Design a protein around this nucleic acid. Structure first.
Ligand SMILES: [Mg+2]
Ligand SMILES: [Mg+2]
Ligand SMILES: [Mg+2]
Ligand SMILES: [Mg+2]
Ligand SMILES: [Mg+2]
Ligand SMILES: [Mg+2]
Ligand SMILES: [Mg+2]
Ligand SMILES: [Mg+2]
Ligand SMILES: [Mg+2]
Ligand SMILES: [Mg+2]
Ligand SMILES: [Mg+2]
Ligand SMILES: [Mg+2]
Ligand SMILES: [Mg+2]
Ligand SMILES: [Mg+2]
Ligand SMILES: [Mg+2]
Ligand SMILES: [Mg+2]
Ligand SMILES: [Mg+2]
Ligand SMILES: [Mg+2]
Ligand SMILES: [Mg+2]
Ligand SMILES: [Mg+2]
Ligand SMILES: [Mg+2]
Ligand SMILES: [Mg+2]
Ligand SMILES: [Mg+2]
Ligand SMILES: [Mg+2]
Ligand SMILES: [Mg+2]
Ligand SMILES: [Mg+2]
Ligand SMILES: [Mg+2]
Ligand SMILES: [Mg+2]
Ligand SMILES: [Mg+2]
Ligand SMILES: [Mg+2]
Ligand SMILES: [Mg+2]
Ligand SMILES: [Mg+2]
Ligand SMILES: [Mg+2]
Ligand SMILES: [Mg+2]
Ligand SMILES: [Mg+2]
Ligand SMILES: [Mg+2]
Ligand SMILES: [Mg+2]
Ligand SMILES: [Mg+2]
Ligand SMILES: [Mg+2]
Ligand SMILES: [Mg+2]
Ligand SMILES: [Mg+2]
Ligand SMILES: [Mg+2]
Ligand SMILES: [Mg+2]
Ligand SMILES: [Mg+2]
Ligand SMILES: [Mg+2]
Ligand SMILES: [Mg+2]
Ligand SMILES: [Mg+2]
Ligand SMILES: [Mg+2]
Ligand SMILES: [Mg+2]
Ligand SMILES: [Mg+2]
Ligand SMILES: [Mg+2]
Ligand SMILES: [Mg+2]
Ligand SMILES: [Mg+2]
Ligand SMILES: [Mg+2]
Ligand SMILES: [Mg+2]
Ligand SMILES: [Mg+2]
Ligand SMILES: [Mg+2]
Ligand SMILES: [Mg+2]
Ligand SMILES: [Mg+2]
Ligand SMILES: [Mg+2]
Ligand SMILES: [Mg+2]
Ligand SMILES: [Mg+2]
Ligand SMILES: [Mg+2]
Ligand SMILES: [Mg+2]
Ligand SMILES: [Mg+2]
Ligand SMILES: [Mg+2]
Ligand SMILES: [Mg+2]
Ligand SMILES: [Mg+2]
Ligand SMILES: [Mg+2]
Ligand SMILES: [Mg+2]
Ligand SMILES: [Mg+2]
Lengths: 97, 114, 54, 46
RNA sequence: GGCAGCCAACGUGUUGGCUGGGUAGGGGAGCGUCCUGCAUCCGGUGAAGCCGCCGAGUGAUCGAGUGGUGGAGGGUGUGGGAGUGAGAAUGCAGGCAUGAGUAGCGAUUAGGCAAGUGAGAACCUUGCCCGCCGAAAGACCAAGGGUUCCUGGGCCAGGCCAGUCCGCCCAGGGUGAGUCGGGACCUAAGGCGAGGCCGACAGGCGUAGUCGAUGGACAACGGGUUGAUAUUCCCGUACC
RNA sequence: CUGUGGGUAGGGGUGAAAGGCCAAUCAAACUCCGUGAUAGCUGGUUCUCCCCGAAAUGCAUUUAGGUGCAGCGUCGCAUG
RNA sequence: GGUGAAAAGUACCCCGGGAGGGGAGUGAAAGAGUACCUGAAACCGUGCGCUUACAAUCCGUCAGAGCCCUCGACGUGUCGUGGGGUGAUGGCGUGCCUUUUGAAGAAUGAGCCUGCGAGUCAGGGACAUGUCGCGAGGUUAACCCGGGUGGGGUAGCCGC
C-alpha cells in the first residue's frame, strides 16, 4: 500500500497537517493507516471510570512517508536483480525509504 | 420570564387524546397540587403524566437548583406519536384495522414568585 | 344507518368537548405528623390508616 | 351443523399426488419441474 | 384612463377608425418543469429544496429583491429533445381524518375472602370456601402440528383490559425397545410395469414382475424411578 | 353410518336427476399462455392568453343513440 | 436505501421499575442521538391577538363600526396617497366535474393530502403546408473505406 507499519510518515492533509508520526497499524483493504500522535479522539468508556483519548485512522492519501533526511516523498520501486527483489525507493532523493 | 425546567416522555403507550383528558386537569397549577390531583384522579393516563411532571420538578431540583415549592406547571401538552396497525378479523371474512396509538407528553415548569 | 356527510370541525369539536374529566375535591389529613391530601370520601380511612399514602 | 373445510392434511397423499416422483414420471410434470427450477423456486415440488 | 384584433394615413412608429360574450371546434402567440450542444455567470463568505416578508406582470407566473431553515450544486442566453403540467378514470400506492372515545371485548359454569409476591395484582402463587363437568368439560391414542414439553430468565410486541402470568420472547435441557407401532415378512383395491402389442410422432394399454395396509403371520408382564422418557431405564420373573 | 387406501377430469367425469356436484366458484372448473382479446357502449384525458366560431338539418344506410357525403365553423390562397 | 468526515454512538450525575428524558460531555453542527441528510402537505396540539351564546349562513364577495399590530408626520395623541389581522352589521349570492333540450340539483363521480396515471413511436409510407439545398434536373438504397457525425456507391425512384 506503499505505506507500512513502523515507518515514519508526515500527515499531509487534514486537521493534524504538518505532524510527523509512526504508523502503528495499516488497514490495506480500507486504504487507511493508524499513526500515533495524530487524529486523536475522545471516547466515552462505560465502567477505571472515565473518558478515554486514543487515535483514529486517517486515509493513506493524507500522509506521505519521510525521507532519510526528513523530507516527505512519493515512493517508487526499483528492482534488485541480485535477489529478484522489488525495493522501495524515495522518488525525491533516489535512495531507500 | 421565569427560570424553567423541562421534561419529555416520548412513545408512551397512551392515546394522545386520552392523555390530554387528564392533562387538562393540571395545567397551570403548582407541582404539588398537580401531583395530588393526578394521584387521586381515577383515569389511568394519570400514571404517565404524573411521572413526567415529577421528572420536570427534579430537573429544577438538580440542574437549576431552585426552590421546590415555587414550581408551577406552566406548559404541558400531549403530541401524537407513531401508530402501529393491527387487524381484527370480523364476520364473514372481513378484516378491520386497529390503531395502537402513542404520545409524547411535554412539560415546562417555572419557578414563579409566591 | 350511515353518516351522510363527513362531519365538520366545528361540530366535531363541539361534542368532543363534552368528553372531559373533573378533578376530585381534596381535603387535608395529618398522618405520621405530616400533612397529605385525600378525597373527603377516604378521609376516615386515612385517619385510621387504611389508605396507602405513598 | 356440517363444518368440514376443503383442506384435510395428509403427508403421504400430498406426496403421492404432488410429489417429485409423480412429477417426473410423466412429461408435463418434468416440464413443470424444469419451469419451476428456471423461475427460481426454492421448493420445486411437494 | 389602460389593453388588444383587423385596417388606413403619413410614413417607418406613431396616430386614427372600426371591432374585442361564447360551448363543440379551427388558427396564433406564450408560461412553468426536466435532460442536453455552445457561451457566460453564481456558489461552504453557503447551491438546490422548503418556510416566510416585501413586492411585480395582461395570463400561465416572476422575484441575479430579501430573511429563516438547510448543506453541494445552480442561474442566464441561444439552439436541440421530451416519460413536460391532473381535481375527478366506483383510478393506483402510502400516510391520515369522519362516524367516535362510539359499537364491541366471542355463549348458554360463578366466583369470594385471607395471606404472599411485586414498582404496580379483579386476572399470578398458596390456603379455605362456593359453584360447573362427570358416556366428560376425565384417561389414553391415530391423523395432523412441530419443540408448543422441562428448568432458568423476561415482560417491548401478542393476550380483545392489566399482567409479576402465559401455548408469547430468550437460553440450556429433554424423547433410551429383540417383545410396543412400522420396515428388514405377506399380499388386496390399485400403481408402475423388462420384453410386448397398439398408435403419424407425442403416446395407450399390459404380461412376467415389483411395490402398495385399512387386512394375515410374529416373541413381556407387574412394580419403581426423573424437573422433563418409559411394556424402552431399573427391579422381579418371562418368552422368541 | 363411518375410518383408512384407492379410481373416474372439463364438452369431460359423476348424478335414486335438483342443470346437482367436480377444493367457500359450475348452462361447461381452475392456472398460465394467444393477450395490451374485442366492445357502433360507459368512463377519464393534466398550463395560459389572443382572434374567429357552430350543429342538433337533407340524403343513403343489417340503418334509426353509429357512419359516409352534403349543409353550417376555421385557417391558407385566388377573385373583388 | 441515506447518522457523521471519522463512532468521536452520549463517560458520570439526576427523575423514573423500565421506556423516556434533564444536566454534563462528542462533534462544524445533536434544528445530525444508531426512532438518525433535507423534512413539504394532509392530520394533531399548545400559547397569544380579534370575534362569537334572539340566531336560519354554497360559507363567499362588496360596503362597514369597534378593537389589535405596524410604518411616516407633526408632536406628545391625531392624521396619512398609508399597510396588515379580526370582523358587529347591511346588499348580492343555487358547489365542482361529467353528461344533457335543460342539473344547485334529490342524475354520475369525488373523505383528505402527497407521489403516480392518458394522442407516443417506427416507416426514402400517403396528402397538405412551412423552411433549406441544388435546379431541367433532384437524390442515392444495399454496400465499401473512416475509433465519429466524414467520404465514395447510378442499382433504382421521382420530373422530363
Ligand atoms: Mg489526500
Ligand atoms: Mg393514578
Ligand atoms: Mg372465517
Ligand atoms: Mg374495515
Ligand atoms: Mg349443512
Ligand atoms: Mg388601436
Ligand atoms: Mg372573444
Ligand atoms: Mg362586445
Ligand atoms: Mg427554475
Ligand atoms: Mg442550455
Ligand atoms: Mg466557481
Ligand atoms: Mg463551514
Ligand atoms: Mg437539477
Ligand atoms: Mg443561513
Ligand atoms: Mg435558501
Ligand atoms: Mg426548446
Ligand atoms: Mg405525464
Ligand atoms: Mg393529486
Ligand atoms: Mg382520486
Ligand atoms: Mg387509500
Ligand atoms: Mg377519530
Ligand atoms: Mg352514536
Ligand atoms: Mg350508546
Ligand atoms: Mg356497549
Ligand atoms: Mg371470552
Ligand atoms: Mg391480595
Ligand atoms: Mg352437577
Ligand atoms: Mg355417570
Ligand atoms: Mg379427555
Ligand atoms: Mg409450558
Ligand atoms: Mg407486555
Ligand atoms: Mg395487553
Ligand atoms: Mg416465569
Ligand atoms: Mg413458558
Ligand atoms: Mg432379542
Ligand atoms: Mg398387481
Ligand atoms: Mg418399454
Ligand atoms: Mg400400464
Ligand atoms: Mg412390501
Ligand atoms: Mg395395519
Ligand atoms: Mg410426561
Ligand atoms: Mg412400566
Ligand atoms: Mg365401507
Ligand atoms: Mg385418491
Ligand atoms: Mg352434467
Ligand atoms: Mg382454488
Ligand atoms: Mg363449490
Ligand atoms: Mg369446459
Ligand atoms: Mg364454452
Ligand atoms: Mg392477438
Ligand atoms: Mg380497449
Ligand atoms: Mg365574436
Ligand atoms: Mg360530416
Ligand atoms: Mg372548408
Ligand atoms: Mg462542543
Ligand atoms: Mg446543520
Ligand atoms: Mg421519522
Ligand atoms: Mg431528519
Ligand atoms: Mg347577540
Ligand atoms: Mg329568510
Ligand atoms: Mg355578508
Ligand atoms: Mg342571500
Ligand atoms: Mg346517462
Ligand atoms: Mg345528463
Ligand atoms: Mg332527460
Ligand atoms: Mg350530487
Ligand atoms: Mg343534495
Ligand atoms: Mg347515468
Ligand atoms: Mg359517492
Ligand atoms: Mg400510480
Ligand atoms: Mg413518422
Amino acid at each position: 500500500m506503499k505505506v507500512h507499519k513502523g515507518d515514519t510518515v508526515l500527515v499531509i492533509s487534514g486537521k493534524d497537517k504538518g505532524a510527523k508520526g509512526k504508523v502503528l497499524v495499516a488497514y490495506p483493504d480500507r486504504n487507511k493507516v493508524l499513526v500515533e500522535g495524530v487524529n486523536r479522539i475522545k471516547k466515552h468508556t462505560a465502567v477505571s471510570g472515565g473518558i478515554v483519548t486514543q487515535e483514529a485512522p486517517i486515509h493513506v492519501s493524507n500522509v506521505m512517508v519521510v525521507d532519510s533526511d526528513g523530507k516527505p516523498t512519493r515512493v517508487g520501486y526499483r528492482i534488485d536483480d541480485e535477489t529478484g527483489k522489488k525495493v522501495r525507493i524515495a522518488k525525491t532523493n533516489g535512495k531507500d525509504i | 420570564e421565569f427560570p424553567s425546567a423541562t421534561a419529555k416522555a416520548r412513545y408512551v403507550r397512551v392515546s394522545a387524546t386520552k392523555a390530554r383528558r387528564v392533562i387538562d386537569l393540571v395545567r397551570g397549577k403548582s407541582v404539588e397540587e398537580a401531583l395530588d390531583i393526578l394521584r387521586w384522579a381515577p383515569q389511568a393516563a394519570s400514571e404517565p403524566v404524573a411521572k413526567v411532571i415529577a421528572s420536570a420538578a427534579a430537573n429544577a431540583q438538580n440542574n437549576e437548583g431552585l426552590d421546590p415549592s415555587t414550581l408551577v406547571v406552566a406548559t404541558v401538552y400531549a403530541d401524537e406519536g407513531p401508530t402501529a396497525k393491527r387487524i381484527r378479523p370480523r364476520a364473514q371474512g372481513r378484516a378491520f384495522r386497529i390503531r395502537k396509538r402513542t404520545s409524547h407528553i411535554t412539560v415546562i415548569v417555572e419557578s414563579r414568585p409566591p | 344507518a350511515v353518516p351522510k356527510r363527513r362531519m365538520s370541525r366545528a361540530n366535531t369539536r363541539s361534542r368532543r368537548a363534552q368528553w372531559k374529566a373533573e378533578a376530585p375535591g381534596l381535603v387535608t389529613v395529618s398522618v405520621a405528623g405530616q400533612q397529605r391530601k385525600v378525597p373527603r370520601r377516604l378521609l376516615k380511612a386515612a385517619r385510621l390508616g387504611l389508605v396507602d399514602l405513598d | 351443523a356440517k363444518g368440514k373445510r376443503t383442506f384435510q392434511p395428509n403427508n403421504r397423499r400430498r406426496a403421492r399426488v404432488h410429489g417429485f416422483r409423480l412429477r417426473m414420471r410423466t412429461r408435463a410434470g418434468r416440464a413443470i419441474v424444469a419451469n419451476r427450477r428456471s423461475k427460481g423456486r426454492r421448493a420445486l415440488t411437494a
